Amino acid sequence: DVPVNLYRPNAPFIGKVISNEPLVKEGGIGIVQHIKFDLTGGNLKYIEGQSIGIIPPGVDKNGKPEQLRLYSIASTRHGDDVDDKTISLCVRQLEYKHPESGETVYGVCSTYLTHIEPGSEVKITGPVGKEMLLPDDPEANVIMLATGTGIAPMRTYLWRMFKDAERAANPEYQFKGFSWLVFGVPTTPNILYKEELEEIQQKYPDNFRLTYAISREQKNPQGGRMYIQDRVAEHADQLWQLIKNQKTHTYICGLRGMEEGIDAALSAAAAKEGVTWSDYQKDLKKAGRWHVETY
Ligand SMILES: Cc1cc2nc3c(=O)[nH]c(=O)nc-3n(C[C@H](O)[C@H](O)[C@H](O)COP(=O)(O)OP(=O)(O)OC[C@H]3O[C@@H](n4cnc5c(N)ncnc54)[C@H](O)[C@@H]3O)c2cc1C
């Protein structure tokens, strides 16, 4: 029932770009694009939490073909238009430093994707992943801990849960649990999907809580920049009490390195009741209730 590897690298699906929109507003850092592809003429199906691969054109420095890079699917199974014909990605352009040969290095696939024109054909493989799947239990609690483009799987959950057109398209899933997104970004113009996230929080104030950690605008208690681990420590007691519920699932997605500060906050909270978090967390992973995708 979970689609996996309907397309593979040796014969990928050739989709077309429908749109390529910027998500970072003026005054923000970097480039993050929302890219929608046309899936008609193929049999690519997917569900929420999965990833697809993109094969960029060209060769590396050794003259070998460029391999695929994985990207979290940013749309629900129905696509952004709820017509079951499209798939969306949330792609940040990668670029970096001088202690890595030259001046500015541009990431191959992310530069390729963020500057791709509507009408362009793209090689798409997948879907892949069973680690970030949403339970069909409408009474689940869902804690979502995201930084940057780790917002992508979270957007697929929230849209399925809260969009009017999704609710009408998924009669079997009418969410009525509680979900809490803690979203870490550097600036307010960097809050990907800000308007849509904040509309959900207005319509469903008892089912969705939205917390930001904005590091260039907020300070933690120690005087440093506000990062997501600082917001998690602020609410560590509350987060631990929700995690104790049998219905609660936790999702962590973003760049690698956020997990260590989430654990240290939850460890101190758990210790107060004689629980060692690292052993409780092993049981949550085994039970399928602790979901991590960092990169
Ligand atoms: C499951 C999964 C899901 C992902 N989802 C997304 C998503 O939704 N959105 C998204 O934007 N990305 C996502 N990523 C990352 C994405 O796959 C690519 O790694 C990323 O886009 C960069 O690829 P590239 O082709 O642009 O870079 P490459 O051209 O391969 O450049 C990357 C290489 O350069 C180096 N490098 C990178 N950063 C630095 C640095 N700061 N300093 C020094 N060297 C560095 C490393 O050698 C790295 O292997 C995901 C990754 C995985 C594994």
CSV table of C-alpha atoms and ligand atoms in Angstrom, one decimal:
chain,number,residue,atom,x,y,z
A,1,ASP,CA,0.0,0.0,0.0
A,2,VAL,CA,3.1,2.2,0.3
A,3,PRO,CA,4.4,2.8,-3.2
A,4,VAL,CA,8.2,2.3,-3.5
A,5,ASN,CA,10.6,2.4,-6.5
A,6,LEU,CA,8.0,2.7,-9.2
A,7,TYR,CA,10.8,4.2,-11.2
A,8,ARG,CA,14.5,3.5,-10.9
A,9,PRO,CA,17.7,5.2,-12.1
A,10,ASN,CA,18.2,2.9,-15.1
A,11,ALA,CA,14.8,4.1,-16.6
A,12,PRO,CA,13.5,7.2,-14.8
A,13,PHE,CA,10.2,9.0,-15.3
A,14,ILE,CA,10.5,12.0,-17.5
A,15,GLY,CA,8.3,14.7,-16.0
A,16,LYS,CA,7.8,18.3,-17.0
A,17,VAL,CA,8.1,21.4,-14.8
A,18,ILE,CA,4.8,23.3,-14.5
A,19,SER,CA,6.0,26.0,-12.2
A,20,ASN,CA,9.0,27.3,-10.2
A,21,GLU,CA,8.2,29.9,-7.5
A,22,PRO,CA,10.5,31.6,-5.0
A,23,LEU,CA,9.7,31.0,-1.3
A,24,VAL,CA,12.3,33.3,0.2
A,25,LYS,CA,10.9,36.9,0.4
A,26,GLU,CA,13.0,40.0,0.0
A,27,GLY,CA,15.3,40.6,2.9
A,28,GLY,CA,15.8,36.9,3.4
A,29,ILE,CA,18.9,34.7,3.2
A,30,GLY,CA,19.4,32.4,0.2
A,31,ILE,CA,17.2,30.9,-2.5
A,32,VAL,CA,14.5,28.3,-1.8
A,33,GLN,CA,12.1,27.4,-4.7
A,34,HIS,CA,8.8,25.6,-4.8
A,35,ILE,CA,8.8,23.5,-8.0
A,36,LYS,CA,5.8,21.6,-9.3
A,37,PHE,CA,6.1,18.8,-11.9
A,38,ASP,CA,3.6,17.2,-14.2
A,39,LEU,CA,3.1,13.5,-13.6
A,40,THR,CA,0.7,12.7,-16.4
A,41,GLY,CA,1.8,10.0,-18.8
A,42,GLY,CA,3.4,7.9,-16.1
A,43,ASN,CA,2.4,5.9,-13.1
A,44,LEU,CA,4.3,7.7,-10.3
A,45,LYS,CA,2.2,7.4,-7.1
A,46,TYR,CA,3.4,8.5,-3.7
A,47,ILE,CA,2.2,9.3,-0.2
A,48,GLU,CA,3.1,11.8,2.5
A,49,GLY,CA,6.6,11.6,4.1
A,50,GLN,CA,8.3,10.1,1.0
A,51,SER,CA,11.1,11.3,-1.2
A,52,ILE,CA,11.9,11.3,-4.9
A,53,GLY,CA,15.3,11.4,-6.7
A,54,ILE,CA,16.3,13.9,-9.4
A,55,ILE,CA,19.1,13.1,-11.9
A,56,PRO,CA,20.8,16.3,-12.8
A,57,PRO,CA,22.3,16.7,-16.3
A,58,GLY,CA,26.0,16.7,-17.0
A,59,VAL,CA,29.1,15.0,-15.7
A,60,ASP,CA,31.3,15.4,-12.6
A,61,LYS,CA,35.0,16.3,-12.7
A,62,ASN,CA,36.0,12.7,-13.7
A,63,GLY,CA,33.7,12.7,-16.7
A,64,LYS,CA,31.2,10.4,-15.0
A,65,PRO,CA,27.4,11.0,-15.2
A,66,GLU,CA,25.9,12.8,-12.3
A,67,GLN,CA,23.9,10.6,-10.0
A,68,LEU,CA,20.6,11.3,-8.3
A,69,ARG,CA,20.0,13.5,-5.3
A,70,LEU,CA,17.0,12.8,-3.0
A,71,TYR,CA,14.4,15.4,-2.2
A,72,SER,CA,11.5,15.2,0.3
A,73,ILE,CA,8.2,15.4,-1.5
A,74,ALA,CA,6.5,18.7,-0.5
A,75,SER,CA,3.0,17.9,-1.8
A,76,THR,CA,0.4,15.5,-0.5
A,77,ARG,CA,-0.4,12.4,-2.6
A,78,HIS,CA,-3.0,14.5,-4.5
A,79,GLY,CA,-0.6,17.3,-5.5
A,80,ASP,CA,-1.0,21.0,-4.7
A,81,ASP,CA,-4.1,21.3,-6.9
A,82,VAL,CA,-5.6,18.2,-5.5
A,83,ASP,CA,-6.0,16.6,-8.9
A,84,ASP,CA,-3.6,13.6,-8.6
A,85,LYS,CA,-1.5,14.9,-11.5
A,86,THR,CA,1.4,16.7,-10.0
A,87,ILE,CA,4.2,16.5,-7.4
A,88,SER,CA,6.1,19.4,-5.7
A,89,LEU,CA,9.6,19.9,-4.2
A,90,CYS,CA,11.1,22.4,-1.8
A,91,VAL,CA,14.6,23.0,-3.0
A,92,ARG,CA,17.3,25.3,-1.4
A,93,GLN,CA,20.2,26.3,-3.6
A,94,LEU,CA,23.5,25.1,-2.1
A,95,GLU,CA,26.6,27.3,-2.3
A,96,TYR,CA,29.6,27.6,-0.1
A,97,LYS,CA,33.2,28.5,0.8
A,98,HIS,CA,36.8,29.3,-0.2
A,99,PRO,CA,38.4,26.5,1.8
A,100,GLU,CA,36.9,24.2,-0.8
A,101,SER,CA,38.7,25.1,-4.1
A,102,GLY,CA,38.0,28.5,-5.8
A,103,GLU,CA,35.6,31.2,-4.7
A,104,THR,CA,31.9,30.2,-4.6
A,105,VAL,CA,30.9,26.6,-5.3
A,106,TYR,CA,27.4,26.0,-6.5
A,107,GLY,CA,25.7,22.7,-5.9
A,108,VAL,CA,24.9,20.8,-9.1
A,109,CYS,CA,21.4,19.5,-8.7
A,110,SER,CA,20.1,22.3,-6.4
A,111,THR,CA,21.3,25.0,-8.8
A,112,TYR,CA,19.9,23.0,-11.6
A,113,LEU,CA,16.5,22.7,-10.0
A,114,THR,CA,16.1,26.3,-8.6
A,115,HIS,CA,16.8,27.8,-12.0
A,116,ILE,CA,14.8,25.3,-14.1
A,117,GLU,CA,12.2,26.7,-16.6
A,118,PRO,CA,8.6,25.6,-17.0
A,119,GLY,CA,8.3,23.2,-19.8
A,120,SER,CA,11.7,21.5,-19.0
A,121,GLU,CA,11.8,17.7,-18.8
A,122,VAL,CA,13.2,16.2,-15.6
A,123,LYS,CA,14.4,12.7,-14.7
A,124,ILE,CA,12.5,11.6,-11.6
A,125,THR,CA,12.9,8.3,-9.7
A,126,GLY,CA,11.1,6.8,-6.7
A,127,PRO,CA,9.2,7.2,-4.5
A,128,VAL,CA,11.5,6.1,-1.6
A,129,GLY,CA,11.1,6.0,2.1
A,130,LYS,CA,9.0,4.4,4.8
A,131,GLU,CA,10.6,6.2,7.8
A,132,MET,CA,8.5,9.4,7.7
A,133,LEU,CA,5.0,8.1,7.0
A,134,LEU,CA,1.9,9.6,8.7
A,135,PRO,CA,-0.4,7.3,10.8
A,136,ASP,CA,-3.9,7.1,9.5
A,137,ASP,CA,-5.1,7.5,13.1
A,138,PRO,CA,-7.1,10.8,13.1
A,139,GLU,CA,-6.6,11.2,16.8
A,140,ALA,CA,-2.8,11.0,16.7
A,141,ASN,CA,-0.8,13.8,18.2
A,142,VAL,CA,1.9,15.0,15.8
A,143,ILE,CA,5.0,16.9,16.9
A,144,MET,CA,7.0,18.4,14.0
A,145,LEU,CA,10.5,19.7,14.5
A,146,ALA,CA,11.8,21.3,11.3
A,147,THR,CA,14.6,23.5,10.1
A,148,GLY,CA,14.8,25.1,6.7
A,149,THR,CA,13.8,22.7,3.9
A,150,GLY,CA,12.9,20.1,6.5
A,151,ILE,CA,9.5,21.9,6.4
A,152,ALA,CA,8.8,19.8,3.2
A,153,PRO,CA,7.4,16.5,4.8
A,154,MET,CA,5.7,18.6,7.4
A,155,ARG,CA,3.8,20.6,4.8
A,156,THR,CA,2.4,17.3,3.3
A,157,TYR,CA,1.1,16.3,6.7
A,158,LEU,CA,-0.5,19.7,7.6
A,159,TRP,CA,-2.1,20.1,4.2
A,160,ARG,CA,-3.6,16.6,4.4
A,161,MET,CA,-4.8,17.4,8.0
A,162,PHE,CA,-6.1,20.9,7.5
A,163,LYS,CA,-6.7,22.0,3.8
A,164,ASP,CA,-10.4,22.2,3.0
A,165,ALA,CA,-9.9,20.5,-0.4
A,166,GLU,CA,-7.8,17.7,1.2
A,167,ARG,CA,-10.5,17.1,3.8
A,168,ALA,CA,-13.1,16.8,1.0
A,169,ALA,CA,-10.8,14.4,-0.9
A,170,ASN,CA,-9.9,12.2,2.0
A,171,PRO,CA,-13.2,11.1,3.6
A,172,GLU,CA,-11.3,8.4,5.7
A,173,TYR,CA,-8.9,10.9,7.3
A,174,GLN,CA,-10.5,13.8,9.2
A,175,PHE,CA,-7.9,14.9,11.6
A,176,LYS,CA,-8.9,15.9,15.1
A,177,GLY,CA,-5.8,15.3,17.2
A,178,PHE,CA,-3.2,17.9,18.1
A,179,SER,CA,-0.2,19.0,16.0
A,180,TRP,CA,2.6,21.3,16.9
A,181,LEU,CA,5.2,22.6,14.4
A,182,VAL,CA,8.4,24.2,15.8
A,183,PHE,CA,10.1,25.7,12.7
A,184,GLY,CA,13.6,27.1,12.8
A,185,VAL,CA,14.7,29.7,10.1
A,186,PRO,CA,17.1,32.6,10.1
A,187,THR,CA,14.7,35.4,9.3
A,188,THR,CA,11.0,36.1,8.9
A,189,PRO,CA,11.2,36.4,5.2
A,190,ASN,CA,12.8,32.9,5.3
A,191,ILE,CA,9.7,31.3,6.9
A,192,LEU,CA,8.7,29.0,4.0
A,193,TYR,CA,4.9,28.9,3.5
A,194,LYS,CA,4.4,31.5,6.3
A,195,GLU,CA,1.0,32.7,5.0
A,196,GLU,CA,-0.4,29.2,4.6
A,197,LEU,CA,1.0,28.0,7.9
A,198,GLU,CA,-0.5,30.9,9.8
A,199,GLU,CA,-3.9,30.5,8.1
A,200,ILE,CA,-4.0,26.9,9.4
A,201,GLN,CA,-3.3,28.2,12.9
A,202,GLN,CA,-6.2,30.7,12.6
A,203,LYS,CA,-8.8,28.1,11.4
A,204,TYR,CA,-7.7,25.4,13.8
A,205,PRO,CA,-6.4,27.1,17.0
A,206,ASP,CA,-7.1,24.0,19.1
A,207,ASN,CA,-5.6,21.5,16.7
A,208,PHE,CA,-2.4,23.3,15.5
A,209,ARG,CA,0.2,25.2,17.3
A,210,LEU,CA,3.0,27.1,15.4
A,211,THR,CA,6.2,28.1,17.1
A,212,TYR,CA,9.1,29.8,15.3
A,213,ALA,CA,12.8,30.1,16.2
A,214,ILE,CA,14.2,32.9,14.2
A,215,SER,CA,17.9,33.3,14.8
A,216,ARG,CA,18.6,36.8,13.4
A,217,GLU,CA,15.6,38.3,15.2
A,218,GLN,CA,15.4,36.4,18.4
A,219,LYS,CA,17.8,35.7,21.3
A,220,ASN,CA,17.7,32.7,23.6
A,221,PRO,CA,18.1,33.2,27.4
A,222,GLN,CA,21.9,32.9,27.3
A,223,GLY,CA,22.1,35.9,24.8
A,224,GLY,CA,22.8,33.7,21.7
A,225,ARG,CA,20.8,33.5,18.5
A,226,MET,CA,17.4,31.6,18.8
A,227,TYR,CA,17.8,28.1,17.3
A,228,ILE,CA,15.3,25.3,17.3
A,229,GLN,CA,17.0,23.5,20.2
A,230,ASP,CA,16.4,26.6,22.3
A,231,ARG,CA,12.7,26.5,21.6
A,232,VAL,CA,12.6,22.8,22.4
A,233,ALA,CA,14.3,23.4,25.8
A,234,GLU,CA,11.8,26.1,26.5
A,235,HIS,CA,9.0,23.7,26.0
A,236,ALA,CA,10.8,20.4,27.0
A,237,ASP,CA,8.3,19.6,29.9
A,238,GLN,CA,5.3,20.0,27.6
A,239,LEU,CA,6.9,18.1,24.7
A,240,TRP,CA,7.8,15.2,27.1
A,241,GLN,CA,4.2,15.0,28.4
A,242,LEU,CA,2.8,14.8,24.9
A,243,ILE,CA,5.4,12.2,23.9
A,244,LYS,CA,4.2,10.0,26.8
A,245,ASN,CA,0.8,9.6,25.1
A,246,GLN,CA,0.5,6.4,23.1
A,247,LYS,CA,-1.0,8.3,20.2
A,248,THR,CA,1.9,10.8,19.8
A,249,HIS,CA,4.3,10.7,16.9
A,250,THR,CA,7.4,12.9,16.6
A,251,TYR,CA,9.0,14.0,13.3
A,252,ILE,CA,12.4,15.6,12.9
A,253,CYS,CA,13.6,16.9,9.6
A,254,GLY,CA,16.2,19.3,8.5
A,255,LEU,CA,20.0,19.6,8.2
A,256,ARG,CA,22.0,17.1,10.3
A,257,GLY,CA,23.0,18.2,13.7
A,258,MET,CA,19.7,19.4,15.2
A,259,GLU,CA,19.1,16.0,16.9
A,260,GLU,CA,21.7,16.4,19.6
A,261,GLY,CA,20.1,19.5,21.1
A,262,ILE,CA,16.6,18.1,21.0
A,263,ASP,CA,17.8,15.0,22.9
A,264,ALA,CA,19.6,17.0,25.6
A,265,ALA,CA,16.4,19.0,26.3
A,266,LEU,CA,14.1,15.9,26.4
A,267,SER,CA,16.7,14.0,28.5
A,268,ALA,CA,16.5,16.6,31.3
A,269,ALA,CA,12.7,16.6,31.2
A,270,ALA,CA,12.5,12.8,31.3
A,271,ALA,CA,15.0,12.5,34.1
A,272,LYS,CA,12.7,14.3,36.5
A,273,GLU,CA,10.4,11.2,36.4
A,274,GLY,CA,13.2,8.7,36.6
A,275,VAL,CA,13.3,7.9,32.8
A,276,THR,CA,16.5,7.8,30.8
A,277,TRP,CA,15.5,9.4,27.5
A,278,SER,CA,18.0,7.5,25.4
A,279,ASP,CA,16.4,4.2,26.4
A,280,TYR,CA,12.8,5.5,26.1
A,281,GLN,CA,13.7,6.8,22.6
A,282,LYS,CA,14.9,3.4,21.4
A,283,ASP,CA,11.5,1.9,22.3
A,284,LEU,CA,9.8,4.8,20.4
A,285,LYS,CA,11.8,4.0,17.3
A,286,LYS,CA,11.0,0.3,17.5
A,287,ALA,CA,7.3,1.2,18.0
A,288,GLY,CA,7.5,3.4,14.9
A,289,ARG,CA,6.7,6.6,16.7
A,290,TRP,CA,10.0,8.4,16.4
A,291,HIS,CA,10.7,9.6,12.9
A,292,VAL,CA,14.0,11.2,11.8
A,293,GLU,CA,15.3,12.4,8.4
A,294,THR,CA,18.3,14.7,8.5
A,295,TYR,CA,20.9,15.4,5.8
B,1,LIG,C1,16.2,12.1,2.3
B,1,LIG,C2,16.8,13.4,1.8
B,1,LIG,C3,15.9,14.4,1.6
B,1,LIG,C4,16.3,15.7,1.2
B,1,LIG,N1,15.4,16.6,1.0
B,1,LIG,C5,15.8,17.8,0.6
B,1,LIG,C6,14.8,18.9,0.4
B,1,LIG,O1,13.6,18.8,0.6
B,1,LIG,N2,15.2,20.1,-0.1
B,1,LIG,C7,16.6,20.4,-0.3
B,1,LIG,O2,16.9,21.5,-0.7
B,1,LIG,N3,17.5,19.4,-0.1
B,1,LIG,C8,17.2,18.1,0.3
B,1,LIG,N4,18.1,17.2,0.6
B,1,LIG,C9,19.6,17.4,0.2
B,1,LIG,C10,19.7,17.2,-1.3
B,1,LIG,O3,19.6,15.8,-1.6
B,1,LIG,C11,21.1,17.5,-1.9
B,1,LIG,O4,22.1,17.0,-1.1
B,1,LIG,C12,21.3,19.0,-1.9
B,1,LIG,O5,20.3,19.6,-2.6
B,1,LIG,C13,22.6,19.4,-2.4
B,1,LIG,O6,22.8,18.7,-3.7
B,1,LIG,P1,23.6,19.5,-4.9
B,1,LIG,O7,23.5,18.6,-6.0
B,1,LIG,O8,23.0,20.8,-4.9
B,1,LIG,O9,25.1,19.5,-4.3
B,1,LIG,P2,26.7,18.7,-4.6
B,1,LIG,O10,26.8,19.4,-5.8
B,1,LIG,O11,26.7,17.2,-4.4
B,1,LIG,O12,27.3,19.4,-3.4
B,1,LIG,C14,27.3,18.7,-2.2
B,1,LIG,C15,28.6,18.3,-1.8
B,1,LIG,O13,29.5,19.4,-1.6
B,1,LIG,C16,29.9,19.4,-0.3
B,1,LIG,N5,29.4,20.5,0.6
B,1,LIG,C17,28.0,20.8,0.9
B,1,LIG,N6,27.8,21.8,1.7
B,1,LIG,C18,29.1,22.2,2.1
B,1,LIG,C19,29.6,23.2,3.1
B,1,LIG,N7,28.9,24.1,3.8
B,1,LIG,N8,31.0,23.3,3.2
B,1,LIG,C20,31.7,22.5,2.5
B,1,LIG,N9,31.4,21.5,1.6
B,1,LIG,C21,30.1,21.4,1.5
B,1,LIG,C22,29.9,17.9,0.1
B,1,LIG,O14,31.0,17.2,-0.4
B,1,LIG,C23,28.5,17.5,-0.5
B,1,LIG,O15,28.6,16.1,-0.7
B,1,LIG,C24,17.7,15.9,1.0
B,1,LIG,C25,18.6,14.9,1.2
B,1,LIG,C26,18.2,13.6,1.6
B,1,LIG,C27,19.2,12.6,1.8
